[PDB]
Design an enzyme around this catalytic site. Structure first.
Site, PDB file in Angstrom:
ATOM      1  N   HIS A  41       1.096  -1.214  -0.305  1.00 39.53           N
ATOM      2  CA  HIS A  41       0.139   0.625  -0.408  1.00 39.53           C
ATOM      3  C   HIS A  41       1.206   0.670  -0.436  1.00 39.53           C
ATOM      4  O   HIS A  41       1.606   1.434   0.525  1.00 39.53           O
ATOM      5  CB  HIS A  41      -0.613  -0.113   1.118  1.00 39.53           C
ATOM      6  CG  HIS A  41      -0.318  -0.279   2.737  1.00 39.53           C
ATOM      7  ND1 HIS A  41       0.547  -1.075   3.271  1.00 39.53           N
ATOM      8  CD2 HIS A  41      -0.241   1.138   3.532  1.00 39.53           C
ATOM      9  CE1 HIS A  41       0.823  -0.359   3.806  1.00 39.53           C
ATOM     10  NE2 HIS A  41       0.009   0.349   4.296  1.00 39.53           N
ATOM     11  N   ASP A 156      10.946   3.906 -14.615  1.00 35.55           N
ATOM     12  CA  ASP A 156      11.100   3.890 -12.821  1.00 35.55           C
ATOM     13  C   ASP A 156      11.890   2.141 -12.759  1.00 35.55           C
ATOM     14  O   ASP A 156      11.183   1.835 -11.394  1.00 35.55           O
ATOM     15  CB  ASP A 156       9.884   3.784 -12.641  1.00 35.55           C
ATOM     16  CG  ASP A 156       9.293   4.429 -11.185  1.00 35.55           C
ATOM     17  OD1 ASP A 156      10.144   4.254 -10.796  1.00 35.55           O
ATOM     18  OD2 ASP A 156       8.237   3.953 -10.690  1.00 35.55           O
ATOM     19  N   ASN A 161      10.422  -2.273  -8.328  1.00 34.07           N
ATOM     20  CA  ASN A 161       9.107  -2.314  -9.688  1.00 34.07           C
ATOM     21  C   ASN A 161       9.540  -3.042 -10.195  1.00 34.07           C
ATOM     22  O   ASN A 161       9.127  -3.616 -11.153  1.00 34.07           O
ATOM     23  CB  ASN A 161       9.013  -1.021 -10.323  1.00 34.07           C
ATOM     24  CG  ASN A 161       8.111   0.129  -9.714  1.00 34.07           C
ATOM     25  OD1 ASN A 161       7.424  -0.132  -9.035  1.00 34.07           O
ATOM     26  ND2 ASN A 161       8.663   1.413 -10.308  1.00 34.07           N
ATOM     27  N   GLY A 176       3.331   2.902 -14.965  1.00 30.86           N
ATOM     28  CA  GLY A 176       3.000   3.825 -14.316  1.00 30.86           C
ATOM     29  C   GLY A 176       3.424   4.714 -14.946  1.00 30.86           C
ATOM     30  O   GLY A 176       3.488   6.158 -15.747  1.00 30.86           O
TER      31      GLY A 176
END
Ligand SMILES: Nc1c(-c2ccc(F)c3[nH]ncc23)c2ncc(Cl)cc2[nH]c1=O
EC number: 2.7.11.1
Length: 277
Positions: A41, A156, A161, A176
């Protein structure tokens, strides 16, 4: 309130599921998935490990935190679906199954891989065995080679990731920020040429170089200042590089070449003897 499918090429599904009752108050996410656990989160929202109530398969579902603040907010969030569409299917890239919006919240349903490389390093609590590091370096280079052959820059690349699948393999995800040859990146992994506004596929190779340096030396990367500059001059800082093998240091020096015109590409790296199958 209806959920609206966010269509994209390669979604594998064109239809709601038989379990979804539109006359119920609960969201499509609630009705169509058994929530197993929360994988992560942040300010972006939450990622859950779920089982589809329609076929019982494991997936990962990310949902944004707050309703769309406006058209630009919505466009920025929906762009992650378009980036998955541009990536397409590849064994070393996280596959997007489907995406939808409901109540201003964006939902992305992907294949379930496992914890992020960041989470895995947190649990291992030391420098990763270098044999594990080579596999992650190779799998993410395979992913980068797939993106770059299509004119895509991830922008990124970092442990958060990259996601680990079974048998010590990993997949590049979280598209993203992907752009097709731009948003604020993570300065810890940022290629030096990005500061001067020069964007290319080479920036991903440098970011992967620092990503591998981080997990292989269990060192924390600087956000800025003198230490940030130390890592953009072509050499490795000597303290944590002591445990790295001659071969690993050699590859990282190639990836951390400050001049993007001279920096090795993902395909060039994968053709080196050390990075053989
Ligand atoms: N697929 C997985 C995701 C994931 C979920 C939704 C998305 F839109 C994604 N894009 N790229 C990756 C993901 C994932 N997300 C966060 C954390 Cl902590 C662990 C995760 N584990 C996974 O296997």
């Amino acid at each position: 309130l209806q959920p609206r499918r966010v269509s994209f090429r390669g979604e594998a599904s064109e239809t709601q599921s038989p379990g979804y009752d539109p006359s119920r108050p609960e969201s499509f996410f609630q009705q169509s998935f058994q929530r197993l656990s929360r994988l992560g989160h942040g300010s972006y929202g939450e990622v859950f490990k779920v089982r589809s109530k329609e076929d019982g398969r494991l997936y990962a579902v990310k949902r944004s935190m707050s309703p769309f603040r406006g058209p630009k907010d919505r466009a920025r969030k929906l762009a992650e679906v378009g980036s998955h569409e541009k990536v397409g299917q590849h064994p070393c890239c996280v596959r997007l199954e489907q995406a939808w919006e409901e109540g201003g919240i964006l939902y992305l349903q992907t294949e379930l891989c496992g914890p992020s490389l960041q989470q895995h390093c947190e649990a291992w609590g030391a420098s990763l065995p270098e044999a594990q590091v080579w596999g992650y370096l190779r799998d993410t280079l395979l992913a980068l080679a797939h993106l770059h052959s299509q004119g895509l820059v991830h922008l990124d690349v970092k442990p958060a990731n990259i996601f680990l699948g079974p048998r010590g393999r990993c997949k590049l995800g979280d598209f993203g920020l992907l752009v097709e040859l731009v948003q604020e990146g993570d300065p810890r992994y940022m290629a030096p040429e990005l500061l001067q506004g020069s964007y290319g596929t080479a920036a991903d190779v440098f970011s992967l170089g620092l990503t591998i340096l981080e997990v292989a030396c269990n060192m924390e990367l600087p956000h800025g200042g003198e230490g940030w500059q130390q890592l953009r001059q072509g050499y490795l800082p000597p303290e944590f590089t002591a445990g790295l093998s001659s071969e690993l240091r050699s590859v990282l020096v190639m990836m951390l070449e400050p001049d993007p015109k001279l920096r090795a590409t993902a395909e060039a790296l994968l053709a080196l003897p050390v990075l053989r199958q």
